[PDB]
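Honest question from a wet-lab person: if I give you the sequences of every part of a complex, can you actually get the arrangement of the whole thing, not just the pieces? Trying it with mine:
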Amino acid sequence: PKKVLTGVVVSDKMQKTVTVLVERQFPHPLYGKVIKRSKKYLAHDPEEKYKLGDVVEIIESRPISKRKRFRVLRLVESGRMDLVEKYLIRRQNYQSLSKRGGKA
Amino acid sequence: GRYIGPVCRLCRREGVKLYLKGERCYSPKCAMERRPYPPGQHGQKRARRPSDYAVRLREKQKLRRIYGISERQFRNLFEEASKKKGVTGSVFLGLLESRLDNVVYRLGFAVSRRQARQLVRHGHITVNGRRVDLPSYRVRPGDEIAVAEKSRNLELIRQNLEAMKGRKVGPWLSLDVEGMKGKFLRLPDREDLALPVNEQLVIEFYSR
Amino acid sequence: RNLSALKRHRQSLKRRLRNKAKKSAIKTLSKKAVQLAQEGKAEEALKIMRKAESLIDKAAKGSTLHKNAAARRKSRLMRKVRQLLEAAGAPLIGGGLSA
Amino acid sequence: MVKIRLARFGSKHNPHYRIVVTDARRKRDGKYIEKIGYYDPRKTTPDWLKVDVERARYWLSVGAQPTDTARRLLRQAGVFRQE
Amino acid sequence: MLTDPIADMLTRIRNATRVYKESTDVPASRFKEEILRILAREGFIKGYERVDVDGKPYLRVYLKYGPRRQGPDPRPEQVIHHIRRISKPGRRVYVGVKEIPRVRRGLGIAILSTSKGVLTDREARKLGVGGELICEVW
Amino acid sequence: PTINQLVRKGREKVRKKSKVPALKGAPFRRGVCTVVRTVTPKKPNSALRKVAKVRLTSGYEVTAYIPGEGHNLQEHSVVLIRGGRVKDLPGVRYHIVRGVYDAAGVKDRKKSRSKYGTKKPKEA
RNA sequence: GGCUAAUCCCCCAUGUGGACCCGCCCCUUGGGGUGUGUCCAAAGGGCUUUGCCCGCUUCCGGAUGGGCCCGCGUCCCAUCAGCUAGUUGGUGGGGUAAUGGCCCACCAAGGCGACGACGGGUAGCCGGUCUGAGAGGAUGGCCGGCCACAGGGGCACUGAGACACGGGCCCCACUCCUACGGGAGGCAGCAGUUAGGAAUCUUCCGCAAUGGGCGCAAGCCUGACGGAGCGACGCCGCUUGGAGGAAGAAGCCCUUCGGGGUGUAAACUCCUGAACCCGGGACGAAACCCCCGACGAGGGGACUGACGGUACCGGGGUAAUAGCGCCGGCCAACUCCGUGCCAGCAGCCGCGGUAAUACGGAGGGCGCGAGCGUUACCCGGAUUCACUGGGCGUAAAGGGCGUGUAGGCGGCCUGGGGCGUCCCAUGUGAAAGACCACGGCUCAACCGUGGGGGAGCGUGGGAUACGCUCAGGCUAGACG
Ligand SMILES: [Zn+2]
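Yes, you can. This is the full assembly:
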């Protein structure tokens, strides 16, 4: 069975390709609490239909580019930036916490 | 080096009579008779309280030294006695009493245990028809432990059976003197053993 | 310290040449048939393609052209042709082209 | 070309074989496809050979040249007896 | 903020018995009630009823004890000797049926929560299900 | 630490420091002596102990202890090392295998022969 | 430079069929049907030679083996925090069995990182194995599976397959021949040599068995393998004897000098009889082959062992190795003498400066026994990194305080979804190992055969408390 995943398009800067945030939950191998990890999969939109903040299903497909082994299946729920924001702020915070120079 | 050395020295260290010589360990002299104090310059000395290990120790030894088996095999038995369902202690004793050499002792074909081993390693013992020289052989139930056709005319074995007219045989064993044979009926039960040991102390010993 | 298990090399040479004279054959003929469609030689273009299509499948008969290899070759040539002949329609012969 | 052959499993002087089905190119003591009965040279037990023809015929049917010795054993089993 | 309801419940019960109360109030809920259903059902407590506490719905849990002791300090054998949430938030511990735990050589109990209902170890095992292992009481 | 803490961070596993730099996990290692002193004990016990400098094949310069009522280890003798620190002799983390190489076994030993590298004295 | 055969090679025809373009029908990423056009086949040899065997060609299927790709899992350092330019994506083209920045051209400006990017260090992975009450820690040689290299780096050919340990081309380092132009080499195969090291074997036997290559077969090759040899390196089995025998020899030790101890130990009595000797002497091995039969089934006949004259059976037959650690506490085992903070012991606490159960010998004792100690290393004790199962007033430990980011966690009732979560069925979880049972070799180690168990994941079916989510409603938290 070809794997199917669910997530959110967080990147819309690429040609025919869309970045999908895919959240996964599971009990920790020793500490037992449910930890929530995640991953970005590069999908593949031929007709440039799927936009930012859309929840889509991913489906394992024939390799397409280096690192882009999935095609987009269908749309789940359009209109939900709230998720994307989270991705974005975390990115922003990443600009901080280094040895270049800290400010306010 | 499966031991072999001064015997009634152990009859002495344990304080309990150890039937290691058969005849004689019945005449005023298995040494315990008239000299119960242990060996050494210090035999006649007052003995301080034996630490927990100490007691567990000697109780293990008393057992081992009885069948006269090398710790190496003793240990192994205990190990395999623990893998069996049942009472980790009584099951021990079971195997112990399941030894070819030992059986020959109980069957009465030998004056003592020691003498029994030799009887086997020199091949005077049949088993279900074929001889056997390996004492560590475990007799299964319903085996025909006998005597070598050749060895029947023996000045020793002959003088032994003559004694068996009068003595009862272990409840789990049968023997036909008239034919110098004998069988192993079943694994004897603790309530069927006479040993002066305390299994529990032997088991305890192996958990240190 | 000689080994008669070098004859293989002694032979590989013979095949190296062998395959070579065949592949380069194709390359050339294809590259010939191609330039023709540019100018619009609807007659001889197919006359050459045909000589091509023949050579190709012939190399697949042996060890020269892997197998499906030949196939690529064929698809890559005919498709490259037809498209060109849009500049000057009407295939005179209609050899290597179904329609 | 998948064969059907033996496989050592006894020990020094205690040879115990395994009639099995496996690709030619693998070892004797290598990962087999489907074990189908065993054979004991010395024959210490009254039950010194077993086969399960049902499967044995599958293979030959599919195409699996067996060994000279192997075939021998399969013959005793009655793998090929068309009566 | 109240972070864990059930723990607060259990803990209101422990904290009471220790000082030997006849009864103890506790905010009510369609679950805390189900758990309490067991405590009574097993016998750790007399019982409980819905009570209006200042307009707010509460559960009066009726504590149970043992007889008055002899010699000195006659503080009665506690009926609920031990009680503690096994599964906590941020550490929810779920268990498979084959994995339901025996308590106190089977003397205490274990309250789970199955897709089939809030259960005891015994009942759970009988039903062939398992789930959120709520607490150990013995 | 909270179970979350235990997750973000995890437990630090204790690392063992080998009290023996004989480089390899080799039980012994040969070496040539350099200086053979007589170091004095620690605080409580006092006396005069026999010790030796040894340059190893691994390439470490160390101080080895020499047991026995007295040896015969000269300036450039080859020897063997087993290792075992000496409580009251600081810096002495190793030992000398008596009886191997150009190092001898004690004379007149009639006891713990297994160690010291003596030999079964033929009785008469 | 010249000759010449072939199942080597090439041309032409046939085309069952198959390939490519184009069109359509179905399907649904490059799957299948179909129509016109075009292109593509092939070798012969042997006999018991009018037929049978081997081999040949195209195509569909099978079987086995393998390429690529995806989810999850996969060590340490943050005194490594930002990494990236073919780099991320797109179009076309190349190339392959084939997807693909794999490669190229152009276009675009991306892609990854604290859920630790990049950098550094270290290390083949696993079935299993060691330990552990378990969780866990440690490990991955022997056997099995997967991967990677075959002096160092690069490259391709030929081929079903290689980028190819005992094939090739080039460069490099090394070693050797050299008429100094120029060459020849690769034991991480077996054995062996040397070096390094604490340390790791015989330049053995055999091709009988099992397997493998080539052959119609007879058969050839097979340091794959089956065997031997060497190493107490481990484990398991075996022996150095058994029975009798003093109120107790001698000698050695101890003494309160009367005696105790070594000690049934010896001696001596009898009995058995490893070694050793003679004789017999093996399974493993029945095929391919050959014959009858139809080269089918079925049946008959022949050959053939390295181990090895070994195992093993029969007969006879000598009483016939013991050692090492330890005896202050932990820890089973106590006296004399020597010594005198010396000599020395010592894991830890410590012992020793004239009375040493702790040094050195001795008697004696304990422990274990062809072994016993020692050092090294793994797990354990250590709930002393604490999931199980720890802590922070003064023992080491609350951040100098607040603010709030990401994150974690969250109140009552109702419903939907059912992701987590739980139950069921099913495929998988190779073999060997472990476990139980039965059996094999006089036992056991070792081995065989049969049974059972399992976490994890795939698919299907179900449940809905609790977590999650969506919806609606509340007011006890919060806020006004
Ligand atoms: Zn006696």
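Two things worth pointing out. The CA atoms of residues 63 and 197 of chain B lie 7 Å apart. Residues 52-67 of chain B form the longest helix (16 residues).
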